[PDB]
Amino acid sequence: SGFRKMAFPSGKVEGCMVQVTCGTTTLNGLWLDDVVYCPRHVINYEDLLIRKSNHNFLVQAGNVQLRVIGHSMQNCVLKLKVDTANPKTPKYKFVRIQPGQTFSVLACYNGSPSGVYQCAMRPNFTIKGSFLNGSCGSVGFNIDYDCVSFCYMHHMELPTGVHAGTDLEGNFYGPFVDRQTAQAAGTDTTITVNVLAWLYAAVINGDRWFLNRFTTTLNDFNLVAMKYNYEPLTQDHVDILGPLSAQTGIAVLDMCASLKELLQNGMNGRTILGSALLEDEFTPFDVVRQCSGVTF
Amino acid sequence: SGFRKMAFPSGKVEGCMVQVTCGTTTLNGLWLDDVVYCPRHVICTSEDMLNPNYEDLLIRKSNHNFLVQAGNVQLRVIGHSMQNCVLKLKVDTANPKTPKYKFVRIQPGQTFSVLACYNGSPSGVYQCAMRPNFTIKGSFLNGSCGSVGFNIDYDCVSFCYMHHMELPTGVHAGTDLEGNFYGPFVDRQTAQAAGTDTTITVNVLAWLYAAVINGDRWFLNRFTTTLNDFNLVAMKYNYEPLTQDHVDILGPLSAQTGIAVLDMCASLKELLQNGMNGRTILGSALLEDEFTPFDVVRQC
Ligand SMILES: O=C(C[C@@]1(C(=O)Nc2cncc3ccccc23)CCOc2ccc(Cl)cc21)N1CCN(CCCO)CC1
């Protein structure tokens, strides 16, 4: 029993964090094989990069300086070719995630991991992270068996305190640019499929007060959901919620009628899994993984 | 900016998780140097669990009865001893991934990261607080026994908890790494209940200072309070008493934000009286008590 915001074990990623210094700027880099990936703002990026030489980039893996033997840019990520392959390189992939998907963030400062937390890619493409100056280059990831899927690299903090970054190919999530200019996070919405997954987790843990005899059509639920700034629930979401629906004996459209009532009436001084708000940062897979005990 | 429930990076602890099997039972062990630490109830059956005599059960065991597995490598147990509720299995190989570590016993209100494991394999890491009733509101399924709680300040791993049991309310009980249980719990299946839980007042205040550091001031007020008047109001909402130590501890955050500790105490009093009014503090509609003053300073 128990339901916690749980991050993936960060060990495979910790062995990859390095410190990248270029001029006055110091941020984090991801050392995989003989390449160090980091935000290109560490340095007109084509013009700024051409002026740099390999010895300008000081890379440090622990107390060992890695010598840069080449550099190239891929979108908003700088790829620094190093002479030494990372002996701690795990099995990895670069994956681009969709809004609503969750990942673990290994927050780093000066190439040293300081903390790990579970995030969600918001529907407005920002992440509500916890980052201070020097956290740029910190990565987001998931673990599948023994494979690390890198999905995020931190680049900036928007004026509202929310964070923006790219996938490991340097493509930003959201309409953001790596430039000091006026940029604002769009109005955010609630990840509906994730809220339903968290309601199933609450039922698995013994919380049933919110359940009701009612059901709803997928269309009627989406008309209500749109009114409360909730993302539309697709047939794919209903299908993905299948396992949890079968395990608890509560159909997805039956849980949608509970969600609809929670939206129109509130909690009424009650909590669900120790929360007075509807939690949307657990995917259906996160609930299954935690309420079954999958290991890495 | 931003305030998240943040766990310590678990890498230093992952390199220590092993699987310990004894008879039908399989749980987790912590392999540090040439010793594997694990809950002593690994030597029990459900027929023993009501009134186990661990000294008697242990004397009947031999080293080859304990099957220890570090990854896909079976370790050889060359000795065993019991220290309180933890079994110490001497093995013939020192763990090459043994980090710099300490065994620390924590006080209620203290936080730590939990590396939840099954079959010696890490499945997840989350943050916990030792509740005032000495339980932890963890996330553990069967097979998680032996999963450890820790803090990682300055490259050293301070092990503070080893998971042993789940109480009937879904909360968890365990020991420090010397085998001493936190709370009035015993490693027996006899009737045991967690005492009434209370909110960790100093942690709530630390989280209100974190909210002020992050720009949330809506809950602040023009009032102050005496420490005694605050405690009289606090006890009525099932909040732990705030001691002069807690007030002293909150000093740095008070100086950084310019809000006197007893001034923040008066804001807490008001929140307890009025609730949030549809507002949130750091993305929460409840007063959060699982961030210590040290956690707030570290993260902010
Ligand atoms: O898992 C246990 C320990 C056990 C316990 O609490 N285990 C668990 C821990 N966390 C989460 C759980 C989630 C669901 C179910 C069990 C969980 C069983 C329940 O009661 C106690 C009372 C005291 C003590 Cl110290 C330990 C326990 N055992 C079963 C009994 N025995 C194994 C012998 C084979 O039957 C020994 C091992």
From Swiss-Prot, chain A:
The gene is rep. Changing P123H: In strain: Omicron/BA.1, Omicron/BA.2, Omicron/BA.2.12.1, Omicron/BA.2.75, Omicron/BA.4, Omicron/BA.5, Omicron/BQ.1.1, Omicron/XBB.1.5, Omicron/EG.5.1. This is 3C-like proteinase nsp5. It catalyses: TSAVLQ-|-SGFRK-NH2 and SGVTFQ-|-GKFKK the two peptides corresponding to the two self-cleavage sites of the SARS 3C-like proteinase are the two most reactive peptide substrates. The enzyme exhibits a strong preference for substrates containing Gln at P1 position and Leu at P2 position. Changing C136A: Complete loss of 3C-like proteinase nsp5 cleavage. There is a cross-link at K5, K81 (Glycyl lysine isopeptide (Lys-Gly) (interchain with G-Cter in ubiquitin)). 3CL-PRO exists as monomer and homodimer. Only the homodimer shows catalytic activity. Interacts with host FBXO22; this interaction promotes the proteasomal degradation of nsp5. The lineage of its organism: Viruses, Riboviria, Orthornavirae, Pisuviricota, Pisoniviricetes. Inhibited by pyridone-containing alpha-ketoamides compounds 13a and 13b. In turn, alpha-ketoamide 13b (tert-butyl (1-((S)-1-(((S)-4-(benzylamino)-3,4-dioxo-1-((S)-2-oxopyrrolidin-3-yl)butan-2-yl)amino)-3-cyclopropyl-1-oxopropan-2-yl)-2-oxo-1,2-dihydropyridin-3-yl)carbamate) inhibits SARS-CoV-2 replication in human lung cells. Inhibited ex vivo by michael acceptor inhibitor N3. Inhibited ex vivo by compound 11a and 11b.
